[PDB]
Each structure stands twice: as structure tokens, then as C-alpha cells.
Design a protein around this ligand. Structure first.
Ligand SMILES: Nc1cccc2c1CC=NC2=O
Ligand SMILES: [Zn+2]
Length: 202
């Protein structure tokens, strides 16, 4: 029961890895991970904040929440599991402005685990491609509702009028991979905490 639910999470984590345009600069060089632990996050207060907002979005989107399971990489995963996602920590600088960003490709979210563009990498070795240090990603329940499809940079403070999120679609002069942006922290729930390492290619 728990093992099968977690095997599904491991499969999503492994199967969504892609080769990155930066040649591994931000997230490191790897084709797969060593998945160490998968924990289900049970935070009743966050779950109800999430389901309350999901119902509200569904009602504003033809009885459809447009919920997706997506990855989130951040140095602040421990604060997110306890306090939830918080749009007050998002700033206008991002490609789609002051939102909370998610990926359908685990390796894209892996580029953010140690900071923007991988920061200086792991705290112990200052290596963005560290194979030793254990990383953590979140696999989240995200309510997209009526998602505004965009290709080019659009610095938003909030969702576009009548919408509940932004979907960043791949394009020639733009994104290599998709990304999903919400502008309200209650529109995501950090369901699984994945502890892993990137693995050195064979
Ligand atoms: N910019 C972007 C795009 C897609 C996923 C993420 C991010 C930022 C932080 N964390 C992420 O997981
Ligand atoms: Zn390290």
C-alpha cells in the first residue's frame, strides 16, 4: 500500500529527468537519482487551507480544480512542510513575476534545491554537482484552475484577470521545459518530501 504509492512517486521522479541546456551547471550532471526516502507530509491545517481554496477554484473553473502533481525545489523545504507555501516570499524578478514555481520535470526543480541557478551548491562541499550530499525535493498537489498559457516573460504580481495560475509553455527563443506558477500559497500542498542524491553517470 505505502510501498506502491511511493514506487509511483519514485517513478515520476526518475522518468521526468531531462538533459538541461546549461549542461548541468545549476543542478549537476546526472541521468538518474539515488532515492533515499519518500515521506508523506500530513499537515492537517495546510491540507484544509489547500482543499478550501481548491473547492473555491473548482467553483470558478466549471467544477474543475485542474489539479496536478508537480515538483518544487527550494532550500526552504522544511519551512514549507511546516508553514506551507507563501507568496509573500516570492518577488517580481522571476520569468512570470512574483509567483511560486513548479515543474513537471524533477530535474528542473533539482536546479533550485540549493538556490537560484543552484546557488553555490551543497553547504558542505560548495558543489552544485555534489553526489555525496543528500538533497530534498517536494512532490506537490497544485491547483492550477483556469491556467493562463504564456510563452514569453510576463512579470505578474498576481494571476491574470479571470485566471488562477500561469502555465509557461516551451518555445524556440524561450523555455526548454514547462513550468507552472501560482500567486497564492494556499493553491499548493507539499504532499511528498523526497530525500535523494543525483547519481554520477555510468
Ligand atoms: N523558476 C522555476 C521553474 C520551475 C520549477 C521551479 C522554479 C523555481 C524554484 N523551484 C522550482 O521547483
Ligand atoms: Zn556536498
Amino acid at each position: 500500500p505505502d510501498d506502491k504509492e511511493f514506487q509511483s512517486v519514485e517513478e515520476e521522479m526518475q522518468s521526468t529527468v531531462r538533459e538541461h541546456r546549461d549542461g548541468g551547471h545549476a543542478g549537476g550532471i546526472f541521468n538518474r537519482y539515488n532515492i533515499l526516502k519518500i515521506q508523506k507530509v500530513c499537515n492537517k491545517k495546510l491540507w484544509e487551507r489547500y482543499t478550501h481554496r481548491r473547492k473555491e477554484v473548482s467553483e470558478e473553473n466549471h467544477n474543475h480544480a485542474n489539479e496536478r502533481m508537480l515538483f518544487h525545489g527550494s532550500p526552504f523545504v522544511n519551512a514549507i512542510i511546516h508553514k506551507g507555501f507563501d507568496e509573500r516570499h516570492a518577488y517580481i524578478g522571476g520569468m512570470f513575476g512574483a509567483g511560486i514555481y513548479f515543474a513537471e520535470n524533477s530535474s528542473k526543480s533539482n536546479q533550485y534545491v540549493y538556490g537560484i541557478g543552484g546557488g553555490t551548491g551543497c553547504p558542505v562541499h560548495k558543489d552544485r554537482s555534489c553526489y555525496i550530499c543528500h538533497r530534498q525535493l517536494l512532490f506537490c498537489r497544485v491547483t492550477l484552475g483556469k491556467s493562463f498559457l504564456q510563452f514569453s516573460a510576463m512579470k505578474m504580481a498576481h494571476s491574470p484577470p479571470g485566471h488562477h495560475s500561469v502555465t509557461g509553455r516551451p518555445s524556440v527563443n524561450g523555455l526548454a521545459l514547462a513550468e507552472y506558477v501560482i500567486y497564492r500559497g494556499e493553491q499548493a500542498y507539499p504532499e511528498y518530501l523526497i530525500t535523494y542524491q543525483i547519481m554520477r553517470p555510468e
